[PDB]
């Protein structure tokens, strides 16, 4: 129990034994064996007859502290602990079973915690310190890490690790939550696979980003996706992907890099799909070009309650871009570029479901005509206020994108999904 | 007296002997030691000598102006002082015993006062001069500073320092001060505990911060709360609160961490609630994001005089954030994000009261339709000038957030408070 | 195995050997002639068992890393490789026969990749850094280059070479 004191006695000697720089040069087990030998020699010199199991545990903990991730290691390796949050050296919380729960784990001081955080976030070659007090990273394992330095967090460094749960956003989850019928799931699979241009319009609180992340899961591994986001949220798991992020202007107003810049660059980066996190300005124009230029299969979220409202929003956005384009030209661009619009909305009872899956068919009389392949129809509600509905296929056997599915060999599945939906 | 004339002569000699640039690289104590050496060098030609208790006092006074905050140093050090105000180099007033009073203290010239003000505002990286003649900031020592430059202040630069006072009220204080009726106390308890998005709009001197503290007091201890503010205005008693503070840029215009960065990070720290010390910039948009993409129950303080005014403030703030968001999009985002607005204002008699408790209902055309749950009605003035008024409920049986109450099992409390509130 | 460690040690020794100004001023052949001798002397001091052809290969790799384009150079010299795409130091893809294939060749770390990107775009006189995170250029050879800095690319620089596809879009 008192082995901690022994560690307190030995830690100071460890640095006096071998400099941390020498240990940092090698990640091989040789460092671990050397640390174990040094710890055993120090224990013998101190002449302490501590528990053998306690001695081994102390040696392992010393190795972790010197070169590992400190007391976080038992928590980090555990599979049941979804998320770990640390607020100063004294408090640690873990999200287990979907609920927060405090833990007895502790760190000696904010200095030890800061060293652990710097090691963790430098694993992926990113810096965190009082000069750059805020840092966000994604480890290769897929677990996100976020660290805030003491100069911002008044209670010392704060850290949050969120592990990667795969089956948390897949289309199976959407079907389970009744956000889309299984036939709707099949249709969504076909559309996503066949590189149909997409625009995921959604109302506030509709989880547009979650729907987009689910949709992107159908992209073939070999396609060189490129993602532009105002704030990195998308977690694509394809072997090939490039993640970009905007940079707001500094206090001087200089150094800004807006989404339009990222999309314009992406046009010249040889992508096979452009996944705009959220179209929110003139960048829409450029995105539309990406949809015509040959980067078929791009996607982009947008704020709108109904597909027609989404089209109007895109037109307004392009108009605000300052380009000398009349309404007819903008509508022509939208019709020729966009292939499908998906609408996600938050219903009265707080649930969110895919309300519309519509295909932009063409332009007539400066009015953009759309046909809804799938529509969610409200049929009733419960005494709780829960609103109930059903997904109905409009019966359009041959949507104008049918050729795309045929080229990829998904025509049969598309017909099956459209017919069996009723 | 000879003290002032001797000090002026010594200051003139020191200025003719050295310049501030000669000691800008020295620290406060090092600067004082070098100033003592320079004083000895100057006395070598002036042959000035007096009692140590007086010579050292004169040296300290000279230092207080060479690198300190000028003759304000003896005043700021005091505690009976409530407010300091400077209306030009030749006049300064101080609030003692709750009443203003003229002091014999004086400056040398308006330029010296301007330099002192520049030092005080640069203490937090701010600059006041002809380019930006108006400046406001907070000294982290616990005070608020306002400065106006000569081009606006005709009588020379004007300064105002207001020292912090620890209010830290609790809902019992508000109830006993008649700031809110007991039925209003029950309503606010429900709203706080019900995880309802809540914007505490307030006017000047309304105490829209302490109101935020007492509102937060209702937060469940098990919810991870992350608070963004400046100079740690708030003080929560929950066991799982993360406290963050923005960092003003250094004099080099670098290292700044604005509210936008802190809120965007808090989005990624898995918080159950995001609480903003005060919304005064584009961060509002990022806050609204947090208010709807989960994180139900986030709060935010805003400077506005009326709920309908506060909504316009938020809309303009989002507009100036640089996004090309269509106005209707911003209005829809606000309608779907906010669930309640609380208005705090100071009446003509100087007392703070909760004028409005309103809930955003929806959007009609391009106007946000809101219904007021509680309103404060004024009826006259009493013998001692005190404002006479009472809180009345509109009688709305089922406010929009009712669902949340049902989820949290607070329907009975809310119904009782709304019915008996008349 | 040991070749990589010996190369890393020799690279560190060369970096500490002389200032970057001497290498920059010296011509490619002029600098390489002394670099080969320095590498041979370092190997002899280390007494590393290696072949004369292996010694020449190590010298060439050292020259490429220190002053050349690093492990990306062999891909550049190839003809079948039409496009090259680096998604950070740990991922390299090449477009051959109209198909994108991952290749095992990867850089030491994102810092080396950023240095190589700056060297590549220096040919046209353009410079990329954290203050100008985006860069695009057309080298004199005709190959296009697009580079993104880490502050934007959230997983390391995103070098993208697109070699000149002559007669790609002619009237035929």
Please say whether the beta carbons of B282 and B290 come within 8 A.
no
Decide: A and B in contact? Rule: 3+ Cβ pairs under 8 Å: yes
For residue A134, give how far its alpha carbon lies from the nearest alpha carbon of chain C (Å).
Answer: 13
Q: What Cα–Cα distance (Å) separates residue C6 from each residue in B380, B401, C12, C18, C50?
A: 91, 69, 10, 19, 10
A287: left (phi over 0), alpha (psi -120 to 50) or beta: alpha
Concatenate the DSSP letters of all residues of A208-265 into one string. HHHHHHHHHTTS-TTS-EEEEESS-------SSEEEEE-B---TTS-S-B-HHHHHHH
Chain A residue numbers touching C99 (CB-CB < 8 A)? 222
What is the residue whose two structure tokens read 């709108």?
A304
CA A211/CA A301 separation, integer angstroms: 9
Cα separation of the two ends of chain C: 51
Q: What Cα–Cα distance (Å) separates residue A422 from each residue in A356, A396, A398, A399, B136?
A: 15, 11, 15, 16, 65
Concatenate the DSSP letters of all residues of B186-234 into one string. HHHHHHHHTT--EEEEE-TTS-TTHHHHHHHTTS-TTS-EEEEESS---
Q: Which of A125, A247, A270 sits opposite C160 (nearest CB)?
A: A270
Are C85 and A268 inside 8 Å of each other by CB? no
Are B270 and A95 inside 8 Å of each other by CB? yes
Cα separation of the two ends of chain B: 68
Residues of chain B with a CB closer than 8 angstroms to some CB in chain A: 222, 224, 232, 239-240, 242-247, 249, 253, 255-258, 260-262, 264-265, 267-270, 292-293, 322-326, 329, 332-333, 335-337, 403
Q: List the subunits that have 3+ CB pairs under 8 angstroms with C.
A: A
What is the residue whose two structure tokens read 């290691």?
A73
Cα torsion through A12, A17, A23, A24, rounded to 10:
40
Q: CA-nearest residue of chain A to C146? A: A269
| 3-state secondary structure (DSSP) of residue B178 | coil
Q: What Cα–Cα distance (Å) separates residue C41 from each residue in C5, C6, C70?
A: 16, 12, 22
Nearest to A368 by CA among A331, A340, A399, A339: A331
Are A240 and C100 inside 8 Å of each other by CB? yes
Tell me, rounded to whole angstroms, the distance of Cα A229 from its chain centroid. 10
CA A291/CA A313 separation, integer angstroms: 17
For residue A376, give how far its alpha carbon lies from the nearest alpha carbon of chain B (Å).
Answer: 21
Supply A89's token pair: 């050296």
Taking the CA atoms of B298, B299, B300 and B305 in sequence, report the sign of the dihedral they define. Answer: positive
Supply B334's token pair: 């606000």
What single-letter DSSP state applies at residue A129? B
CA A209/CA A198 separation, integer angstroms: 13
Return the H-helix or E-strand segment holding A184. helix A182-193
Q: Is C138 annotated as a binding residue?
A: yes
Long-range contacts of B367-374 (CB under 8 A, 24+ apart): B368/B308, B368/B311, B368/B331, B368/B334, B368/B335, B370/B307, B370/B308, B370/B311, B370/B341, B371/B396, B371/B399, B372/B307, B373/B187, B373/B399, B373/B418, B374/B181, B374/B184, B374/B187, B374/B421
Supply B288's token pair: 């609204």
Q: Give the strands of the sheet with B367-381, arranged side by side.
A: B241-245, B225-229, B273-279, B299-303, B198-202, B340-346, B352-364, B367-381, B387-393
Residues of chain C with a CB closer than 8 angstroms to some CB in chain A: 83, 85, 87, 91, 93, 95, 99-100, 102, 109-111, 131, 133-134, 136, 144, 146, 148, 151-156, 158, 160, 162
CA A244/CA A283 separation, integer angstroms: 14
Nearest to A113 by CA among A58, A59, A71: A71
Q: Is C168 annotated as a binding residue?
A: no
CA C119/CA C107 separation, integer angstroms: 15
Supply B57's token pair: 């006092």
For residue B339, give how far its alpha carbon lies from the nearest alpha carbon of chain A (Å).
Answer: 13
CB atoms within 10 A of CB A219: 22
Q: List the subunits that have 3+ CB pairs under 8 angstroms with B.
A: A
∠ at Cα B293 (B310, B270), nearest 5°?
110
CA C84/CA C91 separation, integer angstroms: 11
Please say whether the beta carbons of A36 and A88 come within 8 A.
no
Supply A314's token pair: 């895109």
CB atoms within 10 A of CB C45: 10
Return the H-helix or E-strand segment holding A73. helix A72-77
Chain B residue numbers touching A85 (CB-CB < 8 A)? 224, 269-270
Work out how many CB contacts closer than 8 A connect A with C: 59
Please say whether the beta carbons of C35 and C66 come within 8 A.
yes
A87: left (phi over 0), alpha (psi -120 to 50) or beta: beta
Please say whether the beta carbons of B326 and A313 come within 8 A.
yes
| 3-state secondary structure (DSSP) of residue B149 | coil
Cα torsion through A37, A43, A49, A55, rounded to 10:
-50
Nearest to B275 by CA among B305, B310, B309, B243: B243
Phi, psi for residue A97 in degrees, rounded to 5: 55, 25
Residues of chain A with a CB closer than 8 angstroms to some CB in chain C: 125, 138, 222, 224, 232, 239-247, 255, 257, 261-262, 265, 268-270
Nearest to B282 by CA among A151, A277, A249: A249
Instruction: Taking each helix axis as running N to C, give the angle between helix B28-46 and helix B52-66, from 0 to 180 degrees, rounded to the nearest 10.
Output: 120
Nearest to A188 by CA among A357, A308, A360, A395: A357
Supply B256's token pair: 């700044």
Q: Which of A125, A222, A224 sits opposite C85 (nearest CB)?
A: A224
Q: Which of B246, B258, B292 sits opposite A205 (nearest CB)?
A: B292
Q: Which of C134, C136, C146 sits opposite A257 (nearest CB)?
A: C134
What single-letter DSSP state applies at residue B129? S
What is the residue whose two structure tokens read 């950023």?
C114
Taking the CA atoms of B173, B176, B179 and B184 in sequence, report the sign of the dihedral they define. Answer: positive
CA B356/CA B341 separation, integer angstroms: 8
Q: Which of A222, A257, A265 sits opposite C146 (nearest CB)?
A: A265
Cα torsion through B259, B264, B265, B270, rounded to 10:
130
What single-letter DSSP state applies at residue A365? T
Chain B residue numbers touching A162 (CB-CB < 8 A)? 270
What single-letter DSSP state applies at residue A1? -
Please say whether the beta carbons of A235 and A215 come within 8 A.
no
Are B256 and A252 inside 8 Å of each other by CB? no
Are A346 and B336 inside 8 Å of each other by CB? yes
- Binding-site residue positions of A for Mg(2+): 209, 233, 278
CA A320/CA B75 separation, integer angstroms: 54
CB atoms within 10 A of CB A7: 18
What is the residue whose two structure tokens read 């049918």?
A402
CA C131/CA A257 separation, integer angstroms: 10
Burial status of residue A322 (CB atoms within 10 A of its CB: 0-12, 13-18, 19 or more): exposed
CA A363/CA B192 separation, integer angstroms: 50
H helix runs in A302-401, sequence order? 307-320, 327-337
CA C166/CA C144 separation, integer angstroms: 13
CA B421/CA C19 separation, integer angstroms: 81
Concatenate the DSSP letters of all residues of B45-94 into one string. HH-----HHHHHHHHHHHHHHHTS-TTHHHHHH-SS--EEEESSTT-EEE
CB atoms within 10 A of CB A23: 19
Please say whether the beta carbons of A125 and C110 come within 8 A.
yes
| B408 contact partners, CB below 8 Å, separation of at least 6 | B193, B194, B195
């Amino acid at each position: 129990d008192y082995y901690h004191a022994t560690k307190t006695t030995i830690f100071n000697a460890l640095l006096n034994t071998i400099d941390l720089s020498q240990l940092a040069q090698l990640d091989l087990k040789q460092a671990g064996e050397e640390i174990r030998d040094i710890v055993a020699e120090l224990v013998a010199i101190k002449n302490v007859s501590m528990s053998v199991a306690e001695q081994e545990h102390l040696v392992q903990d010393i190795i972790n502290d010197v070169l590992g991730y400190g007391p976080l290691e038992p928590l980090l390796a555990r599979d049941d602990i979804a998320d770990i949050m640390v607020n100063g050296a004294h408090r640690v919380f873990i999200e287990v079973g979907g609920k927060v729960q405090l833990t007895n784990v502790r760190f000696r001081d904010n200095l030890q915690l800061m060293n652990i955080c710097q090691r963790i976030v430098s694993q992926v070659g990113r810096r965190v310190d009082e000069s750059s007090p805020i840092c966000d990273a994604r480890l290769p394992d897929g677990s996100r890490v976020n660290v805030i330095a003491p100069p911002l967090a008044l209670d010392g460094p704060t850290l949050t690790i969120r592990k990667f749960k795969k089956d948390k956003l897949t289309m199976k989850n959407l079907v389970e939550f009744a956000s889309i019928s299984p036939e709707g799931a099949r249709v969504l699979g076909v559309i996503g696979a066949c590189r149909c241009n997409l625009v995921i319009s959604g109302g506030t609180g509709s989880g547009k980003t979650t729907l987009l992340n689910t949709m992107t899961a159908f992209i073939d591994p070999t396609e060189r996706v490129v993602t532009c986001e105002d704030a990195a949220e998308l977690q694509l798991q394809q072997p090939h992907v490039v993640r970009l992020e905007t940079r707001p202007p500094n206090l001087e107003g200089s150094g800004a890099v807006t989404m339009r810049d990222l999309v314009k660059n992406c046009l010249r980066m040889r992508p096979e799909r452009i996944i705009v996190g959220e179209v929110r300005g003139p960048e829409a124009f450029d995105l539309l070009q990406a949809m015509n230029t040959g980067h078929d299969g791009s996607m982009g979220t947008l704020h709108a309650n109904s597909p027609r409202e989404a089209i109007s929003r895109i037109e307004s956005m392009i108009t605000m871009g300052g380009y000398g384009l009349p309404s007819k030209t903008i509508k022509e661009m939208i019709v020729g570029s966009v292939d499908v619009i998906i609408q996600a909305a938050r219903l009265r009872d707080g649930s969110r479901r895919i309300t519309h899956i519509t295909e932009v068919v063409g332009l007539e009389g400066d009015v953009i005509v759309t046909q809804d392949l799938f529509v969610y129809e409200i049929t009733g509600e419960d005494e709780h206020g829960k609103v109930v509905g059903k997904h109905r296929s409009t019966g359009i056997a041959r949507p104008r994108f049918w050729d795309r599915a045929r080229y990829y060999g998904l025509e049969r599945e598309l017909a099956e999904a459209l017919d069996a939906a009723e």
